[PDB]
Amino acid sequence: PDVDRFGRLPWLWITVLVFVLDQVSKAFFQAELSMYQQIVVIPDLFSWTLAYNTGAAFSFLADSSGWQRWLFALIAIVVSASLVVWLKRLKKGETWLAIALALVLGGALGNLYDRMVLGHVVDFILVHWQNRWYFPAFNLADSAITVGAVMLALDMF
């Protein structure tokens, strides 16, 4: 058939599938929510929100701000180029590694588009306990990266 011509390349459609769902989700909450406004789904556990991440977690590394936009965007470019080459070498039949590589590739490009087009990354998933603990907001692209990376760790056993 014609599937042997491309040779494990069509797995990129999983990566493309993640990018569109990540960008269509960020567009919704950015239009229905004010900044830091909450939509309570569970009165103590789960709520939608809207926050812009400028990389303040690593603000201890420099005497200024704004560099996180360019350094973190540069890292995703290098990692993305290595993944596609790694995916091409993957032999036919290694379904576990193929799906896993395509997951981290999509979530990396989604947040990359944010840092290059916008000045920040859009986060809308606020998980928390009542008031004693608040988990940092994330998005779908972070979910595809975390799930794909877990598959890599549990690969050879």
Binding site: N53, G55, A57, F58, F72, I75, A76, V79, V104, G107, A108, N111, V121, D123, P136, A137, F138, N139, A141, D142, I145, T146
Partner: peptide, 4 residues
């Protein structure tokens, strides 16, 4: 790669 992630948001933070």
């Amino acid at each position: 790669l992630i948001s933070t």
